[PDB]
Amino acid sequence: KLHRMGEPHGPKVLLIHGAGFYWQTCFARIIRDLKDRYCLLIPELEGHTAHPREYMVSVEETAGKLGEALEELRVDKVQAIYGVSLGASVAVEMAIRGEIKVMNLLLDGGQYEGMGEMTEQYANIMADAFLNLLAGEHLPSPVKENMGFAANNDVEVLQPLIYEHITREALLHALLAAYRYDLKAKNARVDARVSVLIGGNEIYGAQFTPLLAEISRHPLDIYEFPNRGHAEVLSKEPEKISRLIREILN
Template sequence: MNIHEFGKENKETILMIHPSVVKWDYFENIIPLLQKKYHLLVPALPGYDFENDSDYTSVERIASELNDWLKAEGYLELYAVYGCSMGGSIALMTALGQKIRIRHCVMDGGITPYQLPWIVTRFIALKDYLMMMIGRAGGVGLLEKAFATDDYSREDLQYVADVLRHCSRKTLWRTFDSCNNYKVPDLLPAIDTQIHYWYAKDEEKERKKDLRYMKTKFPQTQFEVLPDLGHGGLVLQKPELFVEMIEKLSV
């Protein structure tokens, strides 16, 4: 797994994990802002790395590999691990399996595992997979119709179309199957990490099950509502607000 680093001279370190159907450069607007103060670690996840011909594996495996890498590289502590959507799932599992101290875990619209019968999860994964395959085949024209009500430019949708064309069928299937069904331990490990769950006001309905899960499984979670944004919009549309929220985690 390629891990891009910025601001190496800084003391506090942040691991930033991108969502599905984008590349690591999802963070390109905030890297110049954050690297002034933080050492940034930005992995290019398997299946979404244009420099590495690989397939996506699973939420659990990627989290385990990130923890192994941090330990092997001699890191002693992370200020935070941040992940959006699929990245939020990986961020949570990274925090739960941490081999070095992680002070904050931020799930921005993070996906939590379904609490449903196994057969039902198969149908949901198949639906998500087929939607992505249709999007890949239809290209930017179809994506424009699908996202007509969202604040995405044609350039944004062309980017997504290019990523979808790069992704293998295996990557797309594993992405949605794993994000919806990864295994959180029944007996949670004792960790000294503050978990934060951020979600956009406009996605509250879509995140209903995730919010319920976090409140039940992780009652110590701190919740924050992001105004006037859709899913995954904070990094892309309000980078200055993102930086402000990261900086105040410990306040």
């Protein structure tokens, strides 16, 4: 389930949303800003739809299926993948598999550790936290502070990104996939230039940049956004993501 907008023959830009998000609300403004010129391809993560017929199994299987959807459209090269949160793990995995050639990765709030048997317990907390946002209830400490929302702006920032018809099972499976992914273990190398977007209020925003740096055959570009938390630039200034994509693609 890969949605296609903008100029079909234009350069290809893939936009991959995160766990609990929705393709159509995550990237509305970005699509509007780039559709004049770019071919925007926007997948739905498994189960992130009104009537889900399946749920996510792993970052690897989601990346594999996406590569097949791209092949359907005869897309074998993309100029950029932007991925937010889990979507950044799917982007990286696409760069590693190599079915499809990837020139640039823009990774916003990626988490790539691989929690092994703690995966279940973290997924369940985060699942509940995210659904609670739909009630306007705040994230539990220390998650709230770690994600960069000590000002209690987590509801105002994240609530608009949570898919309003998401089911807990779908969200949970996506989070299990997110937390299970272990990038270090792959001993991977990517050709893509990697750019990392980091919100300055994310307490551990830079934790994974060393890992990404040994993966890329090219130096990393880091983009810092001050007083911003996890996915805050996407939520409230997606137009800066648009500008950055255009800039990197020149």
